[PDB]
C-alpha cells in the first residue's frame, strides 16, 4: 500500500464512525461511535465525544478476524449485518481473550477498519519505547478524568502517584520538582508532565548509571551523570555496544545511527550525530530493544527442521478445551484458537456422545459446558498454520458411538481436504519424517484397530448452614466411601450528607474545614448537622469561599407536615430537593450567591455497623475469634488508649490481628493502602483478598455469635494434608471432606429451608449435625440419594474410517511398561505418576525409546485445579508430547513458554545432537557431572511494576535457575519499601554466581514479588528464558504477566555475564 493512502486510512480511523457493538452482556446491540486514538493508541467506543466509554489497548490486541466467528455473534442480532462487514477483535492478557465484536454499515468501511487496525498493530509492535512512554502517560491523563483533557493539576498528580505505583515521600519535594520543571499555578501541560516524569525517574534511579560507569573498563560514561541532562555520543554509544553489550552488528556505525534514529524518533534531531540524553540512556537501558532475549532465535531455523520428528520437543497441551479448572470451566473454541496462536502443535480433543448425533467435547462426567464439534474443527483449520505453518497433532480421546466417530471422521476429511494427512509421506521410510516434510499437514492421533484388525457422582450441590443461614452452591464429588465439597461457587437518615449527632457547631465547622483543606476546597460547600442551640431545626453549616460559617436549616410546620424550608424563597420535604437545587442554583442572601458542593459522610458511620465493636480488648477478641470456627470471619475493634484501629480474623484456623492507622481523614492499612472509610475498607476487602487468598466474608456480630455458639462443628480438611488432597478426587479444591460411612442418608421428601429438593444426611451418631445437600433437579436428587445408598451398602469400539485416518503416532499398550522394540509409528500415553516412575527407574531406556518412538505425557485427573506439573525432567529425558494446561499460570508453565518461544514460536524445538547421541546419558550422577558454564547475574532496578490491589507494592526480585536438581539455585534480592515505579535494588549488593551443567536446556527465571503487610511474597511478574537465548551485558528483561503476556514498560535492568568453562 502507498503511504499517501495510509494518511486517509489512519485519519479515518481517527475520526471514527458509529459502529454497532456486540457483547455477551447485552442481548440488544448498542450503536456507539468507534474511533482510534493515536495519542493513547487506543481504539475507544463511546456515545458522547467528550468522554470515551470503553478502553482498548492496541498492543494487547492479539488478532483481528473477519466475519462473525466469535462467541459474541450468537445473539442472532448481527445476522442482519452482512458477513463481510462484521468482525471482532480479541485482546487482553488472559487465556480467555476479552472480545470486542463489531458490525459495520458498509463493506469498504469494514475492510478499511481491519486494514487500519492491522497496520496500527504492526507499528505499535515496532513502536519505539519513548513513543510508547508518551502514549502511556497520555493514557494516565485520559484516566484521571474522562474529559480527555491535556492538563493536570496538583491534586490529580498526587492521586495519580498511586496509579503509577509511586509514593510521594513527603509532598514537599513534589512542589520543589514543580519549581524545577517550571510548571506553575498547580497546572500541568502534557509536556511539563512528561519532563517531570523523566526527572522523577532519573533522580530516583541515577545510582544505576552511577554504578554503570564503574571503573577498570572501557569508557562509556563520563562524570556527567548528575541530574543535568548530558548527551550520549554515537561513537561513544557504539563503543558501548561493541564492548559492554558485545553486539556484532554494533561494529558498523551506520547500524548504530539507524538504531538511535528509530529509538529517539524525533524529527527535530536530524543532526548527523543524533544524541541520547543521559536520562534517555536510562530509558534505553530499560527499553525493549535491549532485551536479554537474543533476536537471532526469532527466525525459525529451517536447517534445524530437517531432523526426523523424533528429535523435537513439541508444543502440546492437555485437555485444552478447559479455559479453567478441569471441573466447572467454560469450554469455548476460542481456547483452541488462542492455543494454536500461542504456537502449540499438538491439541487434545476428548470427544463424547453427540445429543443429536454430532459429537461434542466436555471433560468427562463434569459440568463443563458443551461446544459442537464442527465449530471446533472449523476453527482448527482457520487457525491451524496462520502463526506457525508446521504440522499439528490433534489427539483424540474417543468416547462416542461408532456412527458418531463415522460422522467425526467424515467431517474431518470434508473440512480438511489436502490439509489433513491421509497417506504416509515416505512409505518405505523406517522413521519419523522431518517437520519440514510435514509442513501444512494435520496428524490425527487416535486408537487404531487391534493387532488382528479387531479392537462416581459429581455435580454442583447446595449447602445449608445455620451459621450462614443461606444456601451456597458448592461443587461435590464422591469417592472411596467419602464425599468432598469445594469452596463457595460465588432518605435523609442513610445518606452521606446527614450526620445526626454532631457534638457542636464548632466541631462540624472543623470537620468541614479539614475536609476542605486536605482536598477539594470549594466555595459555599456544606455540611448537614443538628443544632445544639435551636430546637427541632436542622443546620446547614457551610464553608464560605475560603471560610466557614453556620446557619441552621429553618423548619416550620405547614399543611400539618414538616416544611424543611429556608427563608420562604425555597421550601421542600426531602432534604435532597433543597440540597440539589442549592448545588446547581446558588442560594441567594443579601450577602452573596453561593452553592453547595461536598456532602461529607459521617465521621464514624462504622458505629452503626454491627461488625464494628466500640472498645474490645485483645484477649476477649481472641476469645470470640476462637469460638468462631469459620474462615472468612472478621471483626474491627477500636484499640484502647489509641486512635488506631485493629481488625481481627481467623484464617488457616489461626487468629490474626492487623493494626490500621489514620492519616487525615483517611484510614491507612499497613503502610500503603489509603481508604476513606472503614465501611469502604470492608466493602473492598470483601471482593478481594487480604491474607494469602483469604477474603473477608463473614462478619462477627454478637447476634450471629449466639448462633455460632448454637452449633460450632463443621467438618474440615483435617504434607499429610497434601496427601489427603491428592487422595480426594476433588484435589486442592476439596475444602470439606466427610466420611459418608458415618452418615445414613434419608431423602427429605419435602426438603427444608426454602428449597425444592433436599435430602437428609442423618449421621450415625445422632449428635452430629446434618448437612442436607440440595440439588437443582428431583431426578438429580434421586440419583444422588441412591448413590449414597449403595455407598452405605471387524470392529468393536472404533469406526473403521477414522482408524484408517491415523497414519502416525499409533497408540499401543501391547508393550505395556516394556519399552522394547521402539517403532517410529507408535505413541506412549503416560500419566505423570507412572511417567515419573519410569524416569526414576529406566531413564536411559526412555531416551532410547524416544529417539525412535513418540512419548506423550498428560497430567493426572487428580489435578482438577488445572495446575501444571513438573515437566522439566521429562524434556531432559526427551519426552515429546509434554502436554500441559495453557489456561493456568505456574512456574512450570512459564518454563513451557520459555522453551517454546524459540524457533519463532513454531512449537517445535530441535533437540541437541549430543543428547541424541548413544553415548550420552540423560540423568548423570554426581561424579559424571562437570560444571559447564558460569553465569554471573546482578539485577539493579526495575520500571513500571503493575499494581495488584489497593496496596502499593514493596518489591523484591528472585532470580533462579529452572532446571535440574543440581541445576536448581535461587537468589533473592533485598526488598525495597514503597517503591513501585522506580525501584533501586542495592547498588552495593554483590553479583551472584550460577553454575550451569546443562546449558542447552536450562532456564533463567526472573520473578518480581511484593512483600505484603503480612510479609507474604506474591506474584507480580515473571520472565523465563532458555539460557541459550540469554545475551550478555546490561540488558532489560521485559516483564510478563503469569499468562505469558508482556506488560507495558515492565522491565528489570540486569547485568549478566556468561563465561563458558574452559
Amino acid at each position: 500500500l502507498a503511504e499517501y493512502e495510509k494518511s486517509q486510512i489512519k485519519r479515518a480511523l481517527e475520526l471514527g464512525t458509529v459502529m454497532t457493538v456486540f457483547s455477551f452482556r447485552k442481548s440488544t446491540p448498542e450503536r456507539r461511535t468507534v474511533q482510534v486514538i493515536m495519542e493513547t493508541r487506543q481504539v475507544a467506543w463511546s456515545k458522547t465525544a467528550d468522554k470515551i466509554e470503553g478502553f482498548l489497548d492496541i498492543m494487547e490486541i492479539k488478532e483481528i478476524r473477519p466475519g462473525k466467528n466469535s462467541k459474541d455473534f450468537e445473539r442472532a442480532k448481527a445476522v442482519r449485518q452482512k458477513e463481510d462487514c462484521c468482525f471482532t477483535i480479541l485482546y487482553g492478557t488472559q487465556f480467555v481473550l476479552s472480545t470486542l465484536s463489531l458490525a459495520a454499515d458498509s463493506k469498504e468501511d469494514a475492510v478499511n477498519w481491519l486494514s487500519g487496525l492491522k497496520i496500527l498493530h504492526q507499528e505499535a509492535m515496532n513502536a519505539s519505547t519513548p513513543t510508547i512512554i508518551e502514549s502511556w502517560l497520555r493514557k494516565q491523563i485520559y484516566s484521571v478524568d474522562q474529559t480527555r483533557r491535556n492538563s493536570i493539576s496538583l491534586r490529580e498528580l498526587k492521586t495519580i502517584l498511586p496509579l503509577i505505583n509511586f509514593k510521594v515521600s513527603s509532598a514537599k519535594f513534589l512542589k520543589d520538582k514543580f519549581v524545577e520543571i517550571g510548571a506553575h499555578k498547580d497546572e500541568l501541560s502534557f509536556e511539563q508532565f512528561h519532563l517531570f516524569y523523566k526527572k522523577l525517574m532519573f533522580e530516583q534511579q541515577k545510582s544505576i548509571l552511577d554504578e554503570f560507569k564503574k571503573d577498570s573498563s572501557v569508557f562509556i560514561l563520563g562524570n556527567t551523570d548528575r541530574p543535568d541532562a548530558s548527551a550520549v555520543y554515537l561513537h561513544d554509544f557504539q563503543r558501548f555496544l561493541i564492548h559492554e553489550q558485545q553486539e556484532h552488528w554494533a561494529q558498523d556505525l551506520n547500524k548504530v545511527r539507524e538504531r538511535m534514529t528509530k529509538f529517539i524518533d524525533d524529527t527535530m534531531r536530524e543532526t548527523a550525530e543524533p544524541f541520547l540524553f543521559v536520562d534517555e540512556f536510562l530509558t534505553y537501558l530499560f527499553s525493549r530493544e535491549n532485551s536479554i532475549w537474543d533476536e537471532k532465535y526469532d527466525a525459525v531455523d529451517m536447517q534445524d527442521m530437517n531432523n526426523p520428528l523424533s528429535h523435537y520437543w513439541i508444543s502440546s497441551s492437555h485437555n485444552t478445551y478447559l479455559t479453567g479448572d478441569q471441573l466447572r470451566s467454560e469450554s469455548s473454541p476460542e481456547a483452541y484458537i488462542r492455543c494454536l496462536r500461542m504456537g502449540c502443535r499438538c491439541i487434545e480433543l476428548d470427544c463424547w456422545d453427540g445429543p443429536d448425533g454430532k459429537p461434542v467435547i466436555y471433560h468427562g462426567w463434569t459440568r463443563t459446558t458443551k461446544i459442537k464439534f464442527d465449530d471446533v474443527v472449523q476453527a482448527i483449520k482457520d487457525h491451524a498454520f496462520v502463526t506457525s505453518s508446521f504440522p499439528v497433532i490433534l489427539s483424540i480421546e474417543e468416547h462416542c458411538s461408532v456412527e458418531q466417530q463415522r460422522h467425526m471422521a467424515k467431517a474431518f476429511k470434508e473440512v480438511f481436504g489436502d490439509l489433513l494427512l491421509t497417506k504416509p509421506t515416505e512409505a518405505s521410510a523406517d522413521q519419523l519424517p522431518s517437520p519440514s516434510q510435514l509442513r501444512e499437514k494435520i496428524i490425527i492421533k487416535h486408537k487404531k484397530l487391534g493387532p488382528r484388525g479387531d479392537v462416581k457422582q459429581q455435580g454442583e450441590l447446595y449447602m445449608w448452614d445455620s451459621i450462614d443461614q443461606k444456601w451456597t452452591r458448592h461443587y461435590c464429588a464422591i469417592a472411596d466411601a467419602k464425599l468432598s465439597f469445594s469452596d463457595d461457587i460465588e432518605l435523609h437518615f442513610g445518606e452521606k450528607w446527614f450526620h445526626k449527632k454532631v457534638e457542636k457547631r464548632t466541631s462540624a465547622e472543623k470537620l468541614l474545614q479539614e475536609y476542605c483543606m486536605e482536598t477539594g476546597g470549594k466555595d459555599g460547600t456544606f455540611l448537614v448537622r443538628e443544632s445544639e442551640t435551636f430546637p427541632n431545626d436542622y443546620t446547614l453549616s457551610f464553608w464560605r469561599s475560603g471560610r466557614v460559617q453556620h446557619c441552621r436549616i429553618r423548619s416550620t410546620m405547614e399543611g400539618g407536615t414538616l416544611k424543611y424550608y429556608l427563608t420562604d424563597n425555597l421550601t421542600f420535604s426531602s432534604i435532597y430537593a433543597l440540597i440539589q437545587h442549592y448545588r446547581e442554583t446558588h442560594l441567594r442572601c443579601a450577602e452573596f450567591e453561593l452553592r453547595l458542593t461536598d456532602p461529607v459522610p459521617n465521621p464514624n458511620p462504622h458505629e452503626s455497623k454491627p461488625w464494628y465493636y466500640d472498645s474490645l480488648s485483645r484477649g476477649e477478641a481472641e476469645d470470640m475469634l476462637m469460638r468462631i470456627p469459620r474462615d472468612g470471619a472478621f471483626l474491627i475493634r477500636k484499640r484502647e488508649g489509641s486512635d488506631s484501629y485493629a481488625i481481627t480474623f481467623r484464617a488457616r484456623g489461626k487468629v490474626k490481628h492487623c493494626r490500621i492507622n489514620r492519616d487525615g481523614r483517611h484510614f491507612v492499612l499497613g503502610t500503603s493502602a489509603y481508604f476513606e472509610s472503614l465501611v469502604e475498607l470492608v466493602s473492598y476487602y470483601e471482593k478481594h483478598s487480604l491474607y494469602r487468598k483469604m477474603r473477608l466474608r463473614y462478619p462477627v456480630t454478637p447476634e450471629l455469635l449466639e448462633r455460632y455458639n448454637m452449633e460450632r462443628d463443621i467438618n474440615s480438611l483435617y504434607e499429610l494434608e497434601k496427601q489427603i488432597i491428592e487422595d480426594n478426587p476433588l484435589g486442592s479444591l476439596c475444602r470439606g471432606i466427610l466420611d459418608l460411612n458415618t452418615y445414613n442418608v434419608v431423602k427429605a421428601p419435602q426438603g427444608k429451608n426454602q428449597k425444592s429438593f433436599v435430602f437428609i444426611l442423618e449421621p450415625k451418631q445422632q449428635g452430629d449435625p446434618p448437612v442436607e445437600f440440595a440439588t437443582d433437579r428431583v431426578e438429580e436428587l434421586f440419583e444422588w440419594f441412591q448413590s449414597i445408598r449403595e455407598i452405605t451398602w471387524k470392529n468393536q469400539s472404533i469406526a473403521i474410517e477414522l482408524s484408517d485416518l491415523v497414519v502416525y503416532c499409533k497408540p499401543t499398550s501391547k508393550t505395556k511398561d516394556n519399552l522394547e522394540n521402539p517403532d517410529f509409528r507408535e505413541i506412549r500415553s503416560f500419566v505423570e505418576t507412572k511417567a515419573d516412575s519410569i524416569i526414576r527407574q529406566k531413564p536411559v531406556d526412555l531416551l532410547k525409546y524416544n529417539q525412535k518412538g513418540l512419548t506423550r505425557v498428560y497430567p493426572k485427573g487428580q489435578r482438577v485445579d488445572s495446575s501444571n506439573y513438573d515437566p522439566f525432567r521429562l524434556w531432559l529425558c526427551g519426552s515429546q508430547m509434554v502436554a500441559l494446561n495453557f489456561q493456568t499460570a505456574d512456574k512450570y508453565m512459564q518454563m513451557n513458554h520459555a522453551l517454546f518461544s524459540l524457533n519463532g514460536r513454531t512449537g517445535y524445538v530441535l533437540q541437541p545432537e549430543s543428547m541424541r547421541t548413544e553415548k550420552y546419558d540423560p540423568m548423570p550422577p554426581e561424579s559424571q557431572r562437570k560444571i559447564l558454564m558460569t553465569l554471573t547475574v546482578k539485577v539493579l532496578g526495575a520500571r513500571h511494576l503493575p499494581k495488584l490491589g489497593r496496596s502499593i507494592a514493596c518489591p523484591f526480585v528472585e532470580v533462579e535457575i529452572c532446571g535440574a536438581e543440581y541445576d536448581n539455585n535461587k537468589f533473592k534480592t533485598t526488598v525495597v519499601n514503597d517503591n513501585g515505579l522506580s525501584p533501586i535494588w542495592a547498588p552495593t549488593q554483590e553479583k551472584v554466581t550460577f553454575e550451569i551443567y546443562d546449558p542447552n536446556l536450562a532456564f533463567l527465571r526472573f520473578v518480581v514479588y511484593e512483600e505484603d503487610m503480612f510479609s507474604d511474597p506474591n506474584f507480580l511478574a515473571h520472565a523465563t528464558y532458555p539460557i541459550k537465548a540469554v545475551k550478555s551485558g546490561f540488558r532489560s528483561v521485559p516483564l510478563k504477566n503469569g499468562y505469558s503476556e508482556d506488560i507495558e514498560l515492565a522491565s528489570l535492568l540486569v547485568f549478566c555475564e556468561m563465561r563458558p568453562v574452559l
Partner: protein, 307 residues
C-alpha cells in the same frame, strides 16, 4: 370482646417487657416498658416506651374509651410536640397502648424541679446549676407547645385540658403534648371534686367553656395562656389563693392574673390576648407560633443569614 387487627400498629406482646408503672389515672394505668424491635429494620433494638393498660376491674365503657383514644392518636398523626402513638397490642391479651416515653415527666414538675434558689418552697438537693433554664428556654418550651396545638387544631383537635401537667418533657426536654385527643364526655364534670376524682381545669378554662361549656380552639388558646402564666411562674398554680367559687365572679368581672416577676411585657401582652373575653378576637395558634418564633430568634442572640 374482640378487636379487629391493624397490621400497621400491631406489635407482638412478647417483644414488650413491662416495667415500673409511671402514673395512674381514674380508669387506666401507664407503665414504663421496653419494646424490642420497634424499628422493623432493627428487630433487636430496645426502646423505652409508655404502655397504657386498663385496670383489672375496668368496665366496658373504659375499654371503648381506650379504643377511641388509640383511634384518635391514629387519625391525628405524628408530630414532635405531641405524644405519639407507636402501636398497640390488641390480640390475645389485655389491650396495650404503646406510645412514646418521657423520661423527665410533665412540664409542671420539671419546671418546679428547676426553680432557681430563693424561689424554692423547700430545698432541692437535686439542684443542678448546669440545667437552669434561661428565658430562652422558657420561650422555646412555649414555642414547642404552641406548635403542638397548631398541629392538633390543624387536625381539628381541641385538647380541652391544656395544662403543664398535660405536657411531658422528653429526655431531650422536647415538649410533647399529653392527654390530647381524649374524647371525654362533658356530660357531668363537677367543679368541686379535685382532679383524679373529676375536677375540670377550672383555672385553665375560658369563660365560654366555664359557663356555657363552649370548648373551642380559642378555649385552647386561653388554656395555653394559662400555660404561659404557669411557665413564667415556673409551673405556678394558676390563681394563687383564689377559691374555685370566687373564680366565677373574678372571670366574669374580667379579672386576670398578674404579671409574673421574671416575664417580659411582650409575652405578658400575649397572655392578655389569650385571655380576651371574646373568643373570636383571641389570637389563633398560628399567630402565636410565629410571634413566639420571633421572640425566640431575638432571645437566642445568634446570627442567622436572612435569605
Amino acid at each position: 370482646y374482640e378487636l379487629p387487627e391493624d397490621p400497621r400498629w400491631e406489635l407482638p406482646r412478647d417483644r414488650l417487657v413491662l416495667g415500673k408503672p409511671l402514673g395512674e389515672g381514674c380508669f387506666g394505668q401507664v407503665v414504663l416498658a421496653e419494646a424490642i424491635g420497634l424499628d422493623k429494620d432493627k428487630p433487636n433494638r430496645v426502646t423505652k416506651v409508655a404502655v397504657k393498660m386498663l385496670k383489672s376491674d375496668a368496665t366496658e365503657k373504659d375499654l371503648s374509651d381506650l379504643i377511641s383514644e388509640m383511634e384518635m392518636m391514629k387519625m391525628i398523626g405524628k408530630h414532635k410536640n405531641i405524644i405519639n402513638l407507636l402501636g398497640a397490642c390488641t390480640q390475645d391479651g389485655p389491650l396495650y397502648v404503646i406510645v412514646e416515653y418521657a423520661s423527665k415527666g410533665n412540664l409542671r414538675e420539671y419546671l418546679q424541679a428547676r426553680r432557681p434558689p430563693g424561689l424554692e418552697y423547700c430545698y432541692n438537693p437535686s439542684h443542678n446549676p448546669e440545667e437552669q433554664l434561661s428565658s430562652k428556654d422558657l420561650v422555646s418550651c412555649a414555642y414547642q407547645v404552641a406548635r403542638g396545638m397548631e398541629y392538633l387544631a390543624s387536625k381539628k383537635c381541641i385538647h380541652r385540658d391544656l395544662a403543664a401537667r398535660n405536657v411531658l418533657v422528653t429526655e431531650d426536654n422536647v415538649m410533647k403534648i399529653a392527654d390530647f385527643g381524649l374524647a371525654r364526655d362533658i356530660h357531668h364534670i363537677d367543679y368541686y371534686k379535685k382532679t383524679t376524682n373529676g375536677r375540670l381545669p377550672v383555672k385553665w378554662m375560658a369563660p365560654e367553656a366555664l359557663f356555657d361549656r363552649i370548648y373551642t380552639h380559642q378555649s385552647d388558646v386561653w388554656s395555653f395562656g394559662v400555660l404561659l402564666w404557669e411557665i413564667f411562674t415556673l409551673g405556678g398554680s394558676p390563681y394563687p389563693g383564689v377559691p374555685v367559687e370566687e373564680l366565677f365572679k373574678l372571670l366574669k368581672e374580667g379579672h386576670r392574673m398578674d404579671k409574673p416577676s421574671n416575664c417580659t411585657n411582650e409575652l405578658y401582652m400575649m397572655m392578655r390576648d389569650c385571655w380576651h373575653a371574646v373568643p373570636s378576637q383571641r389570637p389563633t395558634f398560628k399567630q402565636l407560633v410565629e410571634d413566639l418564633d420571633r421572640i425566640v430568634a431575638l432571645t437566642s442572640n445568634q446570627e442567622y443569614l436572612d435569605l
